[PDB]
Structure formats: structure tokens, C-alpha cells
Ligand binder design. Sequence first.
Ligand SMILES: [Mg+2]
Ligand SMILES: [Mg+2]
Ligand SMILES: [Mg+2]
Ligand SMILES: [Mg+2]
Lengths: 380, 371, 392, 389
Amino acid sequence: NDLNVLVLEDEPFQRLVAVTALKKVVPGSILEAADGKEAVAILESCGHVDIAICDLQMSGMDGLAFLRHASLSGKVHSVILSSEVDPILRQATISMIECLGLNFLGDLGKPFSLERITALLTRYNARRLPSVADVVRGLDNGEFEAYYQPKVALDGGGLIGAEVLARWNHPHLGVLPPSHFLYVMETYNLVDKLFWQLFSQGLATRRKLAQLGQPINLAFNVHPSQLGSRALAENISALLTEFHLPPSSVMFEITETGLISAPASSLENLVRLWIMGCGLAMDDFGAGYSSLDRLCEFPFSQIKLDRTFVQKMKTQPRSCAVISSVVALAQALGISLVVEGVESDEQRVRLIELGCSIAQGYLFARPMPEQHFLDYCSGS
Amino acid sequence: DLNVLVLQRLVAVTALKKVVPGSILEAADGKEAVAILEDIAICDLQMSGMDGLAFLRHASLSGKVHSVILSSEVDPILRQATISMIECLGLNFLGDERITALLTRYNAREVAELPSVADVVRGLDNGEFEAYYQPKVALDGGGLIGAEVLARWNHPHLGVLPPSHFLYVMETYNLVDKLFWQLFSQGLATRRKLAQLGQPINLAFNVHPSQLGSRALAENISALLTEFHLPPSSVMFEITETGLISAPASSLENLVRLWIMGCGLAMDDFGAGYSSLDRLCEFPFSQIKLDRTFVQKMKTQPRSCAVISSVVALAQALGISLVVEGVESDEQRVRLIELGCSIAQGYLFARPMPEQHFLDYCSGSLEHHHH
Amino acid sequence: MNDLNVLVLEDEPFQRLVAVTALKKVVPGSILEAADGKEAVAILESCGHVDIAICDLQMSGMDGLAFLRHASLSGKVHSVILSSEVDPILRQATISMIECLGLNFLGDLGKPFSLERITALLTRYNARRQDLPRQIEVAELPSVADVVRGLDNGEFEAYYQPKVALDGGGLIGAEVLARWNHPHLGVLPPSHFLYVMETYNLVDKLFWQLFSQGLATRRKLAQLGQPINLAFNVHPSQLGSRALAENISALLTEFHLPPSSVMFEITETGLISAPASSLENLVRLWIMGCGLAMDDFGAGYSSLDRLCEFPFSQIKLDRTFVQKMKTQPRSCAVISSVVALAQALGISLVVEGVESDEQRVRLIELGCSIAQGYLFARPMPEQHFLDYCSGS
Amino acid sequence: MNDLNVLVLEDEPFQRLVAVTALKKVVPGSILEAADGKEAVAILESCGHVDIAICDLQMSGMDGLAFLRHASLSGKVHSVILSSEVDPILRQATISMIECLGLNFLGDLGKPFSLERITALLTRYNARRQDLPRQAELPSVADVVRGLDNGEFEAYYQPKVALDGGGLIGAEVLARWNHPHLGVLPPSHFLYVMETYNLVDKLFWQLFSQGLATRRKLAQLGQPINLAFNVHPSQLGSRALAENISALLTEFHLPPSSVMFEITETGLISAPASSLENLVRLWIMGCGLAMDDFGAGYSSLDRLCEFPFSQIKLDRTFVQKMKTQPRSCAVISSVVALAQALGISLVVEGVESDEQRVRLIELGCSIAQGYLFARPMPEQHFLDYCSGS
Ligand SMILES: [Mg+2]
Ligand SMILES: [Mg+2]
Ligand SMILES: [Mg+2]
Ligand SMILES: [Mg+2]
């Protein structure tokens, strides 16, 4: 009311029947393409397209490449498939449409039953938690921004470094945390993609900080799956070069858990980064069995313990004992320890009493976007 | 007749001008060693070492060094990783006078060893891996229905090698993807010739399970098919039943795109789980294949025959093809025909061949059929 | 949000520890732990509700799925998370199978078990909590103790289900099936006791009670000139005892019965999961001359190869195969392959769960020959069964 | 390339089936399956040689590392393949730890087994078949059963001492076989088997009453040295343990406080809650409790609402690693810090040279065991040792 449908249908009689069925039910314009090249030109100059329709059973490798064109244009919202999808590959097909960053509206067979074209229109406008399609589009569209949380010294004011955190400017929900997209990115293998957007932003921020005479070390989280990648280390350097920042300006964090399930060849990237001089933190330390055995076998330059140690100090003396033990450990290996989630002064002094040097939490600073951080940094 | 580059820099070099008979070059950094071109590179790898990590890197794709002694005895804790890191560049790793001990080791370096990681990375980089082709044939008559594309290494000293001598390496070092694209385009080229000889014959490529998780496998396959002006159905992709079991969660995206494109999809080593019949049901493979042990155990085991029968019925009821592997003799060829099998691979027809042998096999076979 | 309730089923103490440690950090509420069926059913019995069960679908020490089935009958469980992110092709089928139990599928946990991922699944749960069916403590799921006393008070009766030819309904044999004459709940099928008996090693006790009620009946049939063989289910655990085959033979002799008058049935999963030492009893029953049937068949072929000679005279197709015929027609191809298999081995095929005549005709069309199900005859107590066995 | 014997250890029957199915297609030889230890050991005894053991170090109903240790001593096993690619950082330690047993490590299998990866490991095996071995009389199951049924096991005692001085604090009670033919044997030659055939408990009640006889002597003498007895996880099962321990202490006129129980970290981790209730019961009774073999990490601390341990003991390997693995010194430091902050004692084991006695002092360690001070002794020697002090 009024919609804008684009049908891709090669076979001319089929085209004829389809479009004619669409006139009856579809309030609004309708466009027509006899192949990929003609459809990609209807795109090359048109506004929004509410629904794209094409036939994946009949063709085939054209239909797929089209949908990508549909995807790349940024101009299409939803998809109806003009053949019935096989029950056994239903979810496969939907998921495939959604990794294009298109919404799957539905499917139906030629010649179209008119009641079925209504069902899907009603359903469509009825769409007026984020979906897979949403995440992919958000990512293909530079909506993801880097946030910054400082690692400060507990005693004094301090400013030692920062953890780069992923946030998403949602056009309707606003700023969101990883739990609302990492699932999707994790499941569909977009983590790498997000990583490189953020790593670039992060280095740009690192430059502005070097321009300002600030030794703020920027720490990035690396997903274990990336650790298996052939050229991660070689790509991190190429960018560190392109940006004229030195290795040591920068640090990569990997959880203890994720390090457990990491791919056979993870070490090839890890020796790289270590030699290079990049700092390497083992994050959420104390999560597996052999935590102490791990530090032994890999020269991590930092250890981080998480929100729960701090919270548990007061009510649970065993936490204090392990905080102290860890302090000793970092102390004896000559590396840094960051204690996360400090929210109160009580907590802060206790940590000092125990021996901890670095912290993060809402006491000092919540995660911040580039500018608020830069301002924060101009001040210590 | 012996080359040394190295990169206190004077202690080892007078200790070298006392040892190595030949041409001794030298440089202070990457840039100056990269110019020092116009056999052995000794290396300090607590250079820490991005400069310590520019050097070896041109060196490797330059084809300008073969072997690497480090100028430092690194911390045993990441000695393995560091060795993997060298070798992964395609450079051989000798070690850390113990000095002269390894310089005559490899100036000399007979039942000889399995290839090193470095060996395999090199061969991969220097076009030494070649597609071979084994025909799928109509048991009744003499094919020719298709061909499987296999990987062999034209190793410079050892001759032709089967995957046992390189695939572990590539799997552990995430190099299988790189081999696949090499052999895939080789196979597409052969498929052109095959059309050009009037023999449209489907070619099947084995896909490694890890590859199915890769973001744009199917689309690349798609682009490449367009480049070679070949239709999707001239090509097939085979994945082992167990491989599919261990496959990444994203795998179905690639499989559905291939199916939708119209390439064939074969489930290879059918029956190796655990859920075999259930799995066939949930995905529409156009072909399943039996391991060669099924045909071998046909004399001893009435059971082997039974499962062949069962699978023959399974494929005919799904309207898909069945390939039986391991056909080594004529008596097992006729037994297979009683059982209702139709397509086969095996030594009786042809072991895997390099392109030209395969083409000549094809010509001959066509000529035989026409009489 | 509140006292979330999470039960983790994990066999392997180091995975359990990793998982539990991660859950403690992030889950608001209690984390419960089970290493085996016994802990798991105990935890279930004492709990009022279990909001999320985290389950590993292949364990050595526990059948995860069987616990889920039992759990679904309890009323107490909202949702399931799987800790094996396995098998892409079979993933939908695995989901639906969970969903047909009553259960809600939340997602899979990775074998990392990343804290971020965990909170996603919790937010996800928490957004569904209301829309989910109420948790009630169903009193119809007899407790372990309660099962244990029934089994000590002679209230388990043998029922008999005929196996018949598909064209006609001519009698061929029958399976003996366990029913519980529950003092106050009525007559219960295996859904209501078998899983408990399996988990507390009480199956062997049930088998000896039913096996002799059955031989009694087989004796009466012989006397009637009715050559109907009776088939008894042997659970894999029972194969544990080196003397099973010898105990079975002493008992057959005691009842004046030849081995050929009887058959034993083991599931495919059971046969697969048994140590070779244990598989030696089947070889023995086979040599004695008993029939042997491999039960709930249909999954693949690798069970054919466990033993030097295939000891089985019969194969039975899993009940679900008839239901899937319309629902998923590719399953007709498996029925065909299994028909072809049985014929090639020269053994018989039974197809179970035949309820309508439209199924009967299709099964005949596929080449099936012997069948069990509601369409022909319900499980009967002895006298109804005996009377049924007068009509040819 | 033929007549191999391959042993597959696999807990989980579908995984075992897949592996065995793959193995039969490709191995020229025999494929032997073991679903547990009871089966692994039996296959071991009948076998005479096993070319390759395929083994999962992370199983539920079988300890894969234990079995490999036992196989290593039998000298019947050449190579190992691991059925998991687990843990890239800890991989080199794992390989070394295996090679230190005297087994050649071949590689990992992807734990749904590929055919071409099997024949690869096969070609690797063949290449390495004639390599130089390494390192010894292993008694059989039958032998252990009769040995045990015939009172051949004796209690030995190892003092726990102050690292400076040599002051006596306590003693661990140890097991030794007084074997009719091959002499005095340590647990390396019997415990694994007892562990896997449900015989440990029987060994325990013998040595416990032997140890009680010795404590009671010490107590009549007014020499209060607590004796620590190792408890195996399986025994935590029987809910009667503590009643039975309490009843013996009574029979011997001793209080709970005179005695201590030791349990390994991995033992503690492997245990159902139903079992840890038993540990608590001993602690409520007033027995001492130690966690043996400590130092992997911190996860053990959080299994019970109350930590029931008064003592923590590091493994021999730590003293040993001090040189060839300097980083481990940090962990000792760390454990010292832990133990101290917890207000419990820390025992370091396997101290040989006074050189390494000095470093432990630096690091902060106080209590110890090892050959520097006193080697395990039979009753009477130990009774005299104590008399000195
Ligand atoms: Mg982090
Ligand atoms: Mg193949
Ligand atoms: Mg049955
Ligand atoms: Mg001890």
C-alpha cells in the first residue's frame, strides 16, 4: 500500500502469467526482467524494492547471482521464491537468503494461487531480537562501531591501556552488545569480518592517541576460529605497517575456554604475534582445568580475570585466595594482571590490599565510543 | 658450489669463511638482503622480529633460499611453533662445532624420508601438484560416464606421490583449500578438452569438510564455471559420509547453493556411520559411492553382497546413481552386474591417470564402443 | 528473569567442569549436575521444575536422549540446549525430534562454551519463558522406588502382539511386551517404567519374570498345535552376564521347549553398544537354535559387521518408518533397501506400527511381508491372545 | 606394510564403531577394540604386541592416560595415535609426556576418522618402525588378585618434613608389593590393575589397619605424627566409608584427628556429588584431608560449598621441571601464595638434591617429601626414624 515488486523470470510465458497474477493482489508498481543483466539494470536506477521474486528451481546459477546483486545494491528488503522449496532443505534455503542480508518472506509455485500471494503480502506489511538478515545488513553497511574501555591502575588515577569492544548502532534498537549478534556471527562465520572493521577503526584511534603523546595500549579480542586462519598474523602486521603503528602499541585477547577448542594450527599465528611484539592476553583466566599449565607453555604477556572474582570477594574468601595466587603468578612470570568489573571503592582498595595493579569496571569507565574516549584520555 | 646468506655479525662470518667452500653474501636487514640477490639463510628470531619477519617472507616466494639455520637458540617452549612457522613459509629447517655439523649434514642431505611441511608448501607454490583422473564406467559395456579428479604430487626427487604423502600436512596447515582451487581449474580445463573431443563427461571433485564452512565456496565455484564457459552439471562434488558428519554448522549453505546451481553431489564412502540411511534422506545427493572393500569381500562375505543389493535398491528407489569402487577383475564385474550395479571405478578399467593418459583412455574407449 | 534452573548432563568430568564453571558465572539461579542417568533421574525427581536441560546427544555413560524422553513425560522441563553442535544434514531432524517430545529447542552450545554465547541462549530462553507450557509435577511418572516395588510385587504382566502376513493377516508369531499392572494408575506401557529399570539395572529382573510367563504361554500354544514362536526383548545390559544363554537354555528345557520355539530381539543401538564379550551370548543363542531379531532397524549398515557370522534370522523396522511414509516419502526408499537387504540375507522382515489400511497396501507394494500393529491386533494378555490364536 | 595390530580405546560406541569401520578398510592386520580398561588390559595380556594404540585422553568410563602408562611398562606397545586434536598450547607437553613414557607418538586422528588420514598415519608408522626404542616385569591380573588375596601388600611410610631443619610433621602411607618372585614393587606395578578391576578398596582396608597399628604405637608413645592414607575416587562411592573408617579408629583406640586422607585433584574432579558428600563426612569427623598431585589450576576449589582440605601437595614433576622448565617456578610461587591465603599447608614432593631444597625455600615452600630426607620405610624402620625425632 503501495508495494514495489521486482520479478526476475526468464521464460516469457511464465513472466506473463506471474506479473498478471501480481497485478490482481499487489497494490503498487511491478517491474520485469528477462534475465540477470536486465534486473541488475532495473536496480542500477530504482528506489526501494519491497519484494524481489525469482525462481531457484528453474535457474539456477543466475538466480543466486541476481540475489547477490539484489544484496549488493542495498535496495531490496524481502524475497519470495517463485518455486516451492523442498521441505528437506527449507531451513537451508532460508538461511541462504538471509546470509545475503535479504529477508525471506516466503515461497510459492507457478502459476501463483492468488490467496497465497495475499497471505504473504499480509505477512509482509504485518512486519511494520535482531534477525540474521539484520546482522548481515548491519555489517555490510558499517553500522558496527568500536567501543573503548580503559585499563587503569587501581592506585592513583592511572591509564595503562584499553579493551576494544564491539557495539552495533541499530537503526531502530540502538546500541547493542555481542550477545545480540555474536550468536548470529558465530553461527554464520562473520566474526572475521567484524574483526577487521573494528581493527581498522581501532588503529585509527591508536594513531590519534599517538598524535596526542599517549601510550594507551589497545587490546582486541580474537575469536579462536580466526586463530586457525592462514594469514591472520601477516594481515595484522600489514595493517600495523599501513598505519605506521608499532606491534607493541597493540594487544590481542583470547579467552581460556576458546583457547582450549582452538584449531590445531593456532600456534602458528600465536608465535607470529609474540615475535612481532604484540601483547597477548589470556582472557577469562581460570575457566578450564589446566589454567596454570597453560601459562607455563605459552608466554602470555597479560592475564585477565573476570567480573565474578571481584563480586565474590566479600562473601567468598576463596576468591580472594585465588586472586592473591594469581597476583603471585603474574608477579613471578613478569606479566600484567587485569581484574575486571570493579564497581566500588570497597572493591578497589581490597584489590590493592591483595596486590593487583590494573583493573576495569564502571568505577573508572564504562565502554565508550571513539570521541568520549579520546576526551577521557585527554585528562589524567 | 655452495651459497650462504646470514642475517657479533662478524663472529659467525669469519667462523663461516673458515667452513663453507663457495659464495658467501650478507645483509643487515630485509631491504638489504632483498637486494643481496641481484641455499642457506641463518637467522636471529628474537629479532622480535617483524624485521625478523620481513626477510624469510620475500625469501620464500622469491625462491631465493632453500634452508634456514637460526642465529639463535630459541626458548624450547615455542620451539615447535617456531619451526612450524619457518616451514610454513616453504623454507627448510635444519636447526639452531654443532655449526659445521649441520652444514655437511645438508650439503650432503638409499631408502629416503617422507616430505617435510616445507616440501609440501613449496610444491604447492611451485605448481608441482597435478590433477589425475579415474573414469567412472558403465559396468555393462565399458563406460564412459564420468571421472573422479584426484590429487597427485609431481615430487622432484621422489616421483608421483599419492595423498598419503602430503594430505596430513595440508590438513593440519589449512592448505587443502589452496590445493582444491589448483586442481579444480586444472579439471575444468580438462573438461573443456573433453567437450572439444565430443565427450561431455561429468567430472567429480572431492571436497574437504572444512571447505564447506568457507564463506564463498559455492560462489567461487560458480564464478569459475562461468570463466570456463561450462555448465554446472558438467561438474560434481563428492564428500565422504564421515566428513559430512564432522562438517561445520554452515555447511548446508554451500551444499544448497551447489544443489541449486545444478552441480552433482556425491556422498562418498557411503555407510561409514551411524545414521547413514537417515542422512541420505535429509539431503538430496545425486550419487552415492561404495568403498572398495565392498567388492573385495564379495567372495568370502554373502553379507557384503547383501549390502550391495540393499544399496542398489536404495539408489534406484531415490532415483540417483550408485558408483561401486574397487573393480579389480572380470568375475567381480559380472557378479556386480547380477546384483544390479551400473556404475563402477577400479583397476580393471583404469587406475587414476594424468590428463593426457586420461584423454587417450577416453578416445580409445569411444573407439571401442563404436564397434 | 529469576531462579533459572539448569540441568547439565555431561559424562566427562572435565567437560562438565568447564561447562558448569561457565554457567555459574552467567546463569542467575541454580546449576544442577548429572554424570549419569541415576543422578539425572534423581535430580529430576527431587526438583519441582527444570527450566533448561543441557544435553550431549552422544555419551558413553548415559543415554542423553532417553533421559530427555523421560524428562518430557515428567512435565518438569521447558527447554533443551545441545552441547554437541553436530551433523549439519541431520540437524533439522534432531530439532523436530526434540520438539515432538514436548520440549523447546533453545540452541546448541559450542564445545568452547563461550560466556557470551551462553547469555544469548539465556536471553533467548527468557524471551520465551511465558509462551512456554506450564511446568507441572505429573504424578503419573512412577518413581524409581515405586518402579522398584512393583517389580518386587509381581505386577508386571506379559502381553503378546501377533506378527502377521500383510496380505490376509495370517498368524506367524508374536512379540512379548511388558505391561505394568499399576495398583492405582491402571495398565502402563514401557514408557512408564522401562527407562527407570534400564537405568537402575532392573531389566534383568523384569526379563526373568516375563520370560517364564511367556514360556508358559508358548507351552499352551504347542499343546494347541499352534506353532506360533514368541519373541522376547533382550536389553544390552543383560548380555553382561556370561550365563545368560545357559540360563535361557536351562529354562527352555525346564518348560519342555526347544530353542526354535523362541526368538530374542535387541535393538540396533543395543547391538552396536555392546562389548564383544557380551556379543558372545547372541552367538550362543544362535547356536542353541533360537531365532534372533535385530530390532528398531533402519539407521544404516555398519551393525551388519560386528560379528563373524550374522546370527539374525529376522529384522524389524523401526515403528517411525510407517508414520513417515506420507510425512517424508524418501523413507519409502529406505523401506525398499531394507526389503532388498533382508531378502539378500535370506531372513525375514517385520514392519511395526501399521495402523491404517492405506499403510498396509503401500507396505505390500514396497515388498514388505510381515507386520505388527493396531491395524491387525493390539497387545493382548494371555487368554485374549490364546483365544485370538483360534482363527486361520 | 602388513600384519599390524591396532588397539582402539573408545568409550563411546558410535564413535568406536565409526573408527573401527574406518580402520578395517585401511589397516593391513587386526583391529582390537576396548570399550574400557577391563577390556584394554585383557587385550594387552593376550596380545604380546600392539603396533598402534589409538586413544582418547578425555574419556568418561576409562582413563586413557592410565592405560597408556600401563602399556608403556608392559613394553608391548610401539606407537600412539590420539583420537582428539585437543588443545594447541598443551600439545607439545602432551607429546613429550607420552614420549617420556617410552611410546612413539604418531599424530592425531580427527575424531570422526578420515580414510586418507589413517593411511597417512600408517605410512608415518612404517617410516618410523625401525627407530631406536628407549627404556619392566609387569605382573598379570591373576597375579595381582592372588597377591592381594594372600596378604602380600605392605604399608611403607614417608615422612613429611620441614624444608629447613628436617623436623618431622607427618607421614604418607604408601603401598608396596612383597612379591614372591620379583621383589618389592611400587604402585607402577599393580595399582592401575586394582583400579580397573575394583580391587583398590580391598587394598585400602589392609593398609589402613596396618597403618592404624603403627599410628597406635606412635600414640602410646605420645608421638603424635598423623598418618595420611591415599583414598581412591571409587571408594567415595560406598556411602558407608566414613562409618567403616570410624569403626576401625575405635577398634584401634584412635581419634579421627590422628589420621589424614589424601585424594588427587583429578580424582576429586572425576567424582559424582554423591561421592563428595563422603569426603565432607570425614572432615566433619575431624580427619585431615589433602589434595594430592595439585597444580593444574583453580577449578577444584569451587566444587564444594566448603573447601574441606587442610593440605595441598604438589607433584614430583614440579621439583624436576624447576630446571628444564623455569616457568613452572612461578606456579610453585603461585601455589605457595594460594595455600597460604587459604590458611592450609603445602607439601612439596620428590625432593632429591639439597640444591633444589634451597630453591623451594626461596620460592616460599615449607613442608616436603623426598629422598633428600627419607625414603619410604617399612614399619619398624619408620618407627625408629620417628624415635630420633
Ligand atoms: Mg576480553
Ligand atoms: Mg571420492
Ligand atoms: Mg522388539
Ligand atoms: Mg599421596
